[PDB]
Ligand binder design. Structure first.
Ligand SMILES: N[C@@H](CCC(=O)O)C(=O)O
Ligand SMILES: N[C@@H](CCC(=O)O)C(=O)O
Ligand SMILES: [Mg+2]
Ligand SMILES: [Mg+2]
Lengths: 246, 249
């Protein structure tokens, strides 16, 4: 089994600080990518990043309720109350760039897709639903997970990239659990898919030595019941297996 | 030299509507600072994982402390009192993993709950309330105190000669912190007592005949490990064992 590192978030739980990761991301690595998920703590520069990269066969940058701090893309200060995770930002943004340069497969989901865009020099809309023209991409409030993570808008694959290459249909439906989204696309990123309002919702890293894909939706959700989500996780898993085989 | 990849056991926690796997920052920083390793957190996924693949992927394992308690059915103990904190998903991960790791020669360090896991995994039992048995001190942390006091040294620890701790050179007595309501009752077969609290409670064990480093301690040596040499020595010994395994990669 390939060793797939999964990014942690930080959280104070009672008296103590913790590093946490969502069960559903870990189960998707097992059930969809065929990998062994181990959680990468959000320790930033305290860890030798190069040693961390040498030790994993791929990286999953997970979603999170928190938001990339806008200073990393020279954005406007966030509204009071906005959730941030500075320790995660300090870990993931340098890790993305280093992983892609070293040829470690990368899959970014939701916040992790936003991280990929910011890490390569792009910017975000902090409230897509207040921009105008764009849909409200947030999940419905006061609903169970099954409703929040159900398919809610279409997704239009752009030919000639990773998603077309794995054989996804030209249009398929995706879930949508995000209040932020891509504003300026980072240089060197290929657009892989667009929402029907034109929002960029998937990207790949041009010229990357290994699999390097980010998606704005949440394909870890019940991955075995969605052939499109599963196809993405299986392609990521194959790339990780390639690395593990060395 | 290859930094050893040290797996650190997670606990489960429901946060809102989502289940999470969690691990304490102070354990992870002790792996970096004290053992010289790269910590990755092992989810509490039980049988959903190929345990053999997990063992092949790590150079050592740290079984962490936790507020939760091993479920007493695993040592045929009486049902726990109402409200006792348990983590059945962690138990389903760690008890088989301990045995398999030591059988395969993967270095193991167990701290507090993780030391209790080691004793239970090999067939031993626990006292669910050490402070109520009658012959032990109260080994829990003091109630209305901040962490720096709760995790400070609070009782002595007496090394039993001839084992891992004496081999590390630790003194015959040293002070340790104490943040635990449970403790060893019956030692498991195949375990060597390494140290006793002054009341006689077994607070450290090693596995007889293990191919590789296999140590559990009931105190919490991750706490401020860098400035406590008696704690640091344990993490340094663990880290050296993990590095030996990494060198066979
Ligand atoms: N907080 C970010 C990421 C969401 C997520 O990963 O679920 C947003 O609202 O877009
Ligand atoms: N809950 C267990 C373990 C404590 C801990 O690991 O901190 C006890 O009270 O003994
Ligand atoms: Mg959307
Ligand atoms: Mg004690």
């Amino acid at each position: 089994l390939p060793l797939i590192g999964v990014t942690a978030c930080t959280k104070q739980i009672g008296l103590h600080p913790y590093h946490i990761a969502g069960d559903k991301y870990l189960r998707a690595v097992v059930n969809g990518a065929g990998g062994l998920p181990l959680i990468i703590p959000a320790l930033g520069e305290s860890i030798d990043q190069a040693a961390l990269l040498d030790s994993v066969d791929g990286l999953l940058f997970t979603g999170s309720p928190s938001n990339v701090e806008p200073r990393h893309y020279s954005g406007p200060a966030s509204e009071p109350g906005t959730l941030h995770d500075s320790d995660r930002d300090a870990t993931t943004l340098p890790l993305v760039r280093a992983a892609i340069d070293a040829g470690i497969p990368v899959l970014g989901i939701c916040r992790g897709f936003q991280e990929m865009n910011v890490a390569f020099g792009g910017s975000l809309h902090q409230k897509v639903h207040e921009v105008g023209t764009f849909m409200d991409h947030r999940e419905p409030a006061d609903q169970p997970l099954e409703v929040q993570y159900a398919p809610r808008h279409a997704m239009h694959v752009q030919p000639g990239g990773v998603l077309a290459g794995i054989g996804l249909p030209s249009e398929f439906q995706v879930n949508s659990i995000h209040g932020q989204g891509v504003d300026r696309l980072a240089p060197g990123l290929r657009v892989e898919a667009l929402a029907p309002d034109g929002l960029v919702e998937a990207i790949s890293v041009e010229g990357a030595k290994a699999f390097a894909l980010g998606v704005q939706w949440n394909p870890e959700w019940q991955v075995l019941t969605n052939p499109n989500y599963l196809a993405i996780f299986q392609a990521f898993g194959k790339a990780c297996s390639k690395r593990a085989g060395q």
